[PDB]
Amino acid sequence: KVFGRCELAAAMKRHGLDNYRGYSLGNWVCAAKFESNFNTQATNRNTDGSTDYGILQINSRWWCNDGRTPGSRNLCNIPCSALLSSDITASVNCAKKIVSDGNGMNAWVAWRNRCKGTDVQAWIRGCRL
């Protein structure tokens, strides 16, 4: 599913991401924009042989099981394919664990490089939320 921006904002907010670990909803919307372009089906192989999955590009070395990543820990206890669903529940639950791991949203490289320090509230402008 390719979400609209405000559609995603509304779903993330319903699932309790706004202000989760102190990160406003715009941070989460911005991260999804630059991780996946709001596409739940996005997959991207990493250099280490792991793959990133879903709207928040969650990795198969630590967080989910894809059956092809040696050393996988599967800390979210889910198949990586659950992160590709049109229903973002599994991605949100896993993202809540990731952002709680010590480095906050720095865990998302695209957030660090493209969102952090910017006017992230622009990402929810115009939305009825």
Curated annotation (Swiss-Prot):
Pfam families: Lys (PF00062). The active site is at E35, D52. CDD domains: LYZ_C. Its main location: secreted. GO terms for cellular component: cytoplasm; endoplasmic reticulum; extracellular space. Substrate binds at D101. Keywords: Allergen, Antimicrobial, Bacteriolytic enzyme, Disulfide bond, Glycosidase, Hydrolase, Secreted, Signal. InterPro entries: Glyco_hydro_22 (IPR001916), Glyco_hydro_22_CS (IPR019799), Glyco_hydro_22_lys (IPR000974), Lysozyme-like_dom_sf (IPR023346). It comes from the Eukaryota. Its EC number is 3.2.1.17. Disulfide bonds join C6-C127, C30-C115, C64-C80, C76-C94. It catalyses: Hydrolysis of (1->4)-beta-linkages between N-acetylmuramic acid and N-acetyl-D-glucosamine residues in a peptidoglycan and between N-acetyl-D-glucosamine residues in chitodextrins. It is found in: Secreted. One of its GO terms (biological process) is defense response to Gram-negative bacterium. GO terms for molecular function: beta-N-acetylglucosaminidase activity; identical protein binding; lysozyme activity. In the egg white and polymorphonuclear leukocytes. Residues 1-129 form the C-type lysozyme domain. Lysozymes have primarily a bacteriolytic function; those in tissues and body fluids are associated with the monocyte-macrophage system and enhance the activity of immunoagents. Has bacteriolytic activity against M.luteus. Lysozyme C is capable of both hydrolysis and transglycosylation; it also shows a slight esterase activity. It acts rapidly on both peptide-substituted and unsubstituted peptidoglycan, and slowly on chitin oligosaccharides. Monomer. Belongs to the glycosyl hydrolase 22 family. This is Lysozyme C. It comes from Gallus gallus (Chicken). The lineage of its organism: Eukaryota, Metazoa, Chordata, Craniata, Vertebrata. The gene is LYZ.
